[PDB]
Design an enzyme around this catalytic site. Structure first.
Site, PDB file in Angstrom:
ATOM      1  N   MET A 151       0.808  -1.184   0.000  1.00  0.00           N
ATOM      2  CA  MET A 151       0.000   0.000   0.000  1.00  0.00           C
ATOM      3  C   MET A 151       0.867   1.270   0.000  1.00  0.00           C
ATOM      4  SD  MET A 151      -3.561  -0.891   1.970  1.00  0.00           S
ATOM      5  CE  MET A 151      -2.872  -1.196   3.618  1.00  0.00           C
ATOM      6  N   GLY A 152       2.083   1.183  -0.544  1.00  0.00           N
ATOM      7  CA  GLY A 152       3.075   2.292  -0.433  1.00  0.00           C
ATOM      8  C   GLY A 152       3.555   2.679   0.997  1.00  0.00           C
ATOM      9  N   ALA A 153       4.099   3.898   1.109  1.00  0.00           N
ATOM     10  CA  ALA A 153       4.688   4.416   2.341  1.00  0.00           C
ATOM     11  C   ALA A 153       5.631   3.354   2.865  1.00  0.00           C
ATOM     12  CB  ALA A 153       3.610   4.800   3.371  1.00  0.00           C
ATOM     13  N   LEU A 154       6.637   3.113   2.056  1.00  0.00           N
ATOM     14  CA  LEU A 154       7.525   2.006   2.153  1.00  0.00           C
ATOM     15  C   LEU A 154       8.496   2.168   3.307  1.00  0.00           C
ATOM     16  CD1 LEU A 154       8.153   1.199  -1.592  1.00  0.00           C
ATOM     17  CD2 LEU A 154       6.330   0.554  -0.119  1.00  0.00           C
ATOM     18  N   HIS A 155       8.846   1.057   3.903  1.00  0.00           N
ATOM     19  CA  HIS A 155       9.838   1.133   4.929  1.00  0.00           C
ATOM     20  C   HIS A 155      10.757  -0.066   4.719  1.00  0.00           C
ATOM     21  CE1 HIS A 155       7.196  -1.890   6.601  1.00  0.00           C
ATOM     22  NE2 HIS A 155       6.214  -1.013   6.514  1.00  0.00           N
TER      23      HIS A 155
ATOM     24  N   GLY B 129      10.875  -2.779   6.131  1.00  0.00           N
ATOM     25  CA  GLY B 129      10.047  -4.018   6.020  1.00  0.00           C
ATOM     26  C   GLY B 129       9.664  -4.362   4.591  1.00  0.00           C
ATOM     27  N   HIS B 130       9.074  -3.388   3.908  1.00  0.00           N
ATOM     28  CA  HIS B 130       8.935  -3.471   2.431  1.00  0.00           C
ATOM     29  C   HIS B 130      10.182  -3.831   1.658  1.00  0.00           C
ATOM     30  CE1 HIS B 130       5.275  -1.025   3.288  1.00  0.00           C
ATOM     31  NE2 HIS B 130       4.813  -2.092   2.661  1.00  0.00           N
TER      32      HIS B 130
ATOM     33  N   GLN C  35     -10.650  -2.753   1.620  1.00  0.00           N
ATOM     34  CA  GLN C  35     -10.239  -3.338   2.908  1.00  0.00           C
ATOM     35  C   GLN C  35     -10.303  -2.287   4.080  1.00  0.00           C
ATOM     36  OE1 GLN C  35      -5.507  -3.557   2.979  1.00  0.00           O
ATOM     37  NE2 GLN C  35      -6.264  -4.119   0.937  1.00  0.00           N
TER      38      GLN C  35
ATOM     39  N   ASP D 202       8.909   9.474  -2.191  1.00  0.00           N
ATOM     40  CA  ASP D 202       9.882   8.616  -1.533  1.00  0.00           C
ATOM     41  C   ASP D 202       9.739   7.155  -2.087  1.00  0.00           C
ATOM     42  OD1 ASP D 202      10.033  11.133   0.070  1.00  0.00           O
ATOM     43  OD2 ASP D 202       8.759  10.156   1.585  1.00  0.00           O
ATOM     44  N   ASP D 203       8.501   6.634  -2.109  1.00  0.00           N
ATOM     45  CA  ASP D 203       8.269   5.244  -2.421  1.00  0.00           C
ATOM     46  C   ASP D 203       9.022   4.875  -3.685  1.00  0.00           C
ATOM     47  OD1 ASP D 203       6.589   5.279  -0.216  1.00  0.00           O
ATOM     48  OD2 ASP D 203       4.716   5.016  -1.377  1.00  0.00           O
TER      49      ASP D 203
ATOM     50  N   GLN E  67      12.999   4.977  -3.370  1.00  0.00           N
ATOM     51  CA  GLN E  67      13.482   3.801  -2.679  1.00  0.00           C
ATOM     52  C   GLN E  67      13.527   2.606  -3.599  1.00  0.00           C
ATOM     53  OE1 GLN E  67      12.867   3.493   1.407  1.00  0.00           O
ATOM     54  NE2 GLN E  67      10.854   4.547   1.309  1.00  0.00           N
TER      55      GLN E  67
ATOM     56  N   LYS F   5       4.424  -9.799   9.484  1.00  0.00           N
ATOM     57  CA  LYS F   5       3.830  -8.792  10.318  1.00  0.00           C
ATOM     58  C   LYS F   5       2.309  -9.013  10.227  1.00  0.00           C
ATOM     59  CE  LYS F   5       2.828  -4.921  12.316  1.00  0.00           C
ATOM     60  NZ  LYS F   5       4.020  -4.101  11.991  1.00  0.00           N
ATOM     61  N   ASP F   6       1.764  -9.009   9.006  1.00  0.00           N
ATOM     62  CA  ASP F   6       0.352  -9.250   8.901  1.00  0.00           C
ATOM     63  C   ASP F   6       0.121 -10.711   8.685  1.00  0.00           C
ATOM     64  OD1 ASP F   6      -0.527  -6.312   9.146  1.00  0.00           O
ATOM     65  OD2 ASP F   6       0.948  -6.193   7.545  1.00  0.00           O
TER      66      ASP F   6
ATOM     67  N   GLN G  15      -3.449 -12.102   7.556  1.00  0.00           N
ATOM     68  CA  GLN G  15      -3.561 -11.822   6.176  1.00  0.00           C
ATOM     69  C   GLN G  15      -2.779 -12.844   5.326  1.00  0.00           C
ATOM     70  OE1 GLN G  15      -2.997  -7.671   4.618  1.00  0.00           O
ATOM     71  NE2 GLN G  15      -1.050  -8.650   4.098  1.00  0.00           N
TER      72      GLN G  15
ATOM     73  N   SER H 131       6.312  -0.780  10.812  1.00  0.00           N
ATOM     74  CA  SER H 131       4.944  -0.475  10.435  1.00  0.00           C
ATOM     75  C   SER H 131       4.947   0.980  10.033  1.00  0.00           C
ATOM     76  CB  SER H 131       4.006  -0.682  11.635  1.00  0.00           C
ATOM     77  OG  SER H 131       2.648  -0.372  11.354  1.00  0.00           O
ATOM     78  N   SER H 132       4.163   1.274   8.996  1.00  0.00           N
ATOM     79  CA  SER H 132       3.841   2.641   8.610  1.00  0.00           C
ATOM     80  C   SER H 132       3.091   3.335   9.746  1.00  0.00           C
ATOM     81  CB  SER H 132       2.984   2.624   7.340  1.00  0.00           C
ATOM     82  OG  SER H 132       1.799   1.820   7.522  1.00  0.00           O
ATOM     83  N   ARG H 133       2.281   2.563  10.484  1.00  0.00           N
ATOM     84  CA  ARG H 133       1.494   3.072  11.602  1.00  0.00           C
ATOM     85  C   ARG H 133       2.339   3.577  12.788  1.00  0.00           C
ATOM     86  NH1 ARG H 133      -2.569   5.114   9.234  1.00  0.00           N
ATOM     87  NH2 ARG H 133      -4.008   3.417   8.699  1.00  0.00           N
TER      88      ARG H 133
HETATM   89  C1  LIG Z   1       9.532  -8.105   6.262  1.00  0.00           C
HETATM   90  O1  LIG Z   1       8.917  -7.340   7.333  1.00  0.00           O
HETATM   91  C2  LIG Z   1       7.842  -6.504   7.192  1.00  0.00           C
HETATM   92  C3  LIG Z   1       7.594  -5.645   8.271  1.00  0.00           C
HETATM   93  C4  LIG Z   1       6.486  -4.778   8.248  1.00  0.00           C
HETATM   94  C5  LIG Z   1       5.663  -4.777   7.199  1.00  0.00           C
HETATM   95  N1  LIG Z   1       4.571  -4.026   6.969  1.00  0.00           N
HETATM   96  C6  LIG Z   1       4.083  -4.382   5.753  1.00  0.00           C
HETATM   97  C7  LIG Z   1       2.974  -3.794   5.180  1.00  0.00           C
HETATM   98  O2  LIG Z   1       2.418  -2.825   5.728  1.00  0.00           O
HETATM   99  N2  LIG Z   1       2.559  -4.299   3.977  1.00  0.00           N
HETATM  100  S1  LIG Z   1       1.190  -3.557   3.148  1.00  0.00           S
HETATM  101  C8  LIG Z   1       0.699  -4.636   1.828  1.00  0.00           C
HETATM  102  O3  LIG Z   1       1.646  -2.144   2.736  1.00  0.00           O
HETATM  103  O4  LIG Z   1       0.080  -3.437   4.129  1.00  0.00           O
HETATM  104  C9  LIG Z   1       4.875  -5.345   5.239  1.00  0.00           C
HETATM  105  C10 LIG Z   1       5.853  -5.614   6.130  1.00  0.00           C
HETATM  106  C11 LIG Z   1       6.931  -6.467   6.093  1.00  0.00           C
END
Ligand SMILES: COc1ccc2[nH]c(C(=O)NS(C)(=O)=O)cc2c1
Ligand SMILES: COc1ccc2[nH]c(C(=O)NS(C)(=O)=O)cc2c1
Lengths: 287, 279
Positions: A38-42, A44-45, A70, A86-87, A90, A158-159, A162, A194-196
């Site tokens: 969903m973008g806003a990459l970190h 983890g992405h 969703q 940014d997305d 990166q 993380k999710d 899902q 997390s983006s959150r």
């Molecule tokens: C490999 O570790 C990580 C750590 C945190 C993460 N957050 C997300 C995420 O938010 N994916 S999305 C599809 O934008 O909702 C992926 C992910 C992977």
């Protein structure tokens, strides 16, 4: 086919553009790797990307789409961080060759019409209070899987719920794609990426460590059994400033039962002010 | 003359004098004398002390075997077979009379830490332990002496012994050897019936959980440990304490040591672990 400049980042908006280009690379023998974001990459992405990248002859498709389906309503949708800027930089830095950035019109020209109905797993945990949340996710994921047609699809743990629903989607619809779960990338203290996270003031950022600590505690407490792995998590969450626990739950790895077992999964959801933090860990139950 | 010493074999001495002449003769030939003090009934914990002493270049290993009747269960022929099979060259196995020919006259009085923790039930135990270890040190004169971390309060008191009396020996503390489920090894473990044996897992579980909770701070760590102890039936916790690594008061962040002691039936168990608070 439109233009594909290899070794460069190629940005498509149109499903048919990414689809044609994808299908083309799939003949030239490259292996299409999909990382739905969903973008806003970190970081983890980027782990997902890097894991995709390390696939022999991989071409890596990063999809960027904030799926309004969703979300609510809801509160979620207009909040969600948006930084294509940014997305995309990166992604260029990472050597990713395709970003797929569809419009909401191009994904949903008929609004919500045909959709995926998840199993009963989807009513639990995060689906408890959000009963159509996972239907949205699975519908968008199916559609991306159909547009791009990867060999493999990469998600975080993380999710975790899902990720299981996705393995289900893929099994139940006979989708010819391997689902890759990738271990959760964590801050230096243990806070799950997390983006959150951006929405935690300092005080909260410091209390937030309590989730990864409770879980890492329970995974070591677990030699003494499930009750002690649970009591150990709960005790850490309790010791922590303005963490309000939604749930703390021990399940089997496929988010079913949880036997007298060894292998299981421990999942926590908590609020820090208004910010809802999720986390989970592998647990082996010892006695 | 120096007593008979056959290199590469297990040479047993009971006489303090004999083992003294051997070690001093060995120190001069360019061997480094390593001491591993034990009370016999050898388990894997002791062999790990031995293996650590073995790996010092030019080490000769002395394993003393001596049941202290001043500090608070005999298998002589088997113990010696284990040492032989570790390739230990010296076993020192004195009588009580050889070690205390004048009874208890001059003794070591420990500092105030001997009064805490394990010195609560047993108020005189570490006086006995420091007295025999000092005497073992002067008999053998090792370059290095090896103790397990199991008895961590004891190891701290030894380091204090050594510093305080200007003893010119290295104290080496060797990480506790555990069973597969993490129960700190001890010779008491075999007394536990299956129920107690199963509940006993909770000391190590508690401590490991604490060590991971510690990123959330000192209180999370303790609360984690305690939650795990509270889930075990028939585990009577005598203490659970977090201290700095020298066993003083836990400082606000940084390195620490979590210690526990518990009764399961008649059997008193202890364990302890490194803690990093904010880690
Ligand atoms: C490999 O570790 C990580 C750590 C945190 C993460 N957050 C997300 C995420 O938010 N994916 S999305 C599809 O934008 O909702 C992926 C992910 C992977
Ligand atoms: C290396 O790991 C260990 C684990 C447990 C141990 N117990 C003892 C012990 O009992 N020593 S004694 C009775 O003072 O001679 C040593 C030891 C070492």
């Amino acid at each position: 086919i439109p233009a594909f400049h290899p070794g460069e980042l190629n940005v498509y908006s149109a499903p048919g553009d990414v689809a044609d280009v994808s299908r083309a690379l799939r003949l030239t023998g490259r292996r299409v790797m999909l990382v739905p974001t969903m973008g806003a990459l970190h970081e983890g992405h980027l782990a997902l990307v890097r894991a995709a990248k390390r696939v022999p002859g991989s071409v890596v498709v990063v999809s960027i789409f904030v799926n309004p389906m969703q979300f609510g309503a809801g509160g979620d949708l207009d909040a969600y961080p948006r930084t294509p800027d940014d997305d995309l930089a990166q992604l260029r830095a990472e050597g990713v060759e395709i970003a797929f950035t569809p419009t909401t019109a191009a994904m949903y020209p008929d609004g919500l019409r045909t959709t995926v109905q998840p199993g009963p797993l989807a009513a639990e945990l995060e689906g408890g209070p959000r009963p159509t949340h996972f239907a949205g996710v699975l519908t968008v994921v199916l559609k991306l899987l159909q547009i791009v047609r990867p060999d493999r699809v990469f998600f975080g743990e993380k999710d975790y719920q899902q990720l299981v629903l996705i393995r289900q989607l893929v099994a139940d619809f006979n989708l010819d794609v391997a689902v890759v779960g990738v271990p959760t990338v964590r801050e230096a203290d243990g806070l799950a990426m997390s983006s959150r996270n951006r929405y935690l003031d300092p005080a909260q950022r410091a209390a937030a460590v309590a989730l990864s600590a409770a879980l890492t505690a329970a995974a070591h407490a677990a030699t003494a059994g499930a009750q002690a792995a649970l009591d150990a998590a709960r005790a850490v969450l309790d010791a922590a400033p303005g963490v309000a626990v939604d749930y703390l739950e021990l399940r089997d790895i496929g988010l079913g039962p949880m036997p007298l077992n060894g292998s299981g999964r421990l999942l926590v959801a908590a609020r820090l002010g208004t910010t809802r933090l999720l986390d989970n860990i592998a647990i082996e139950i010892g006695t």
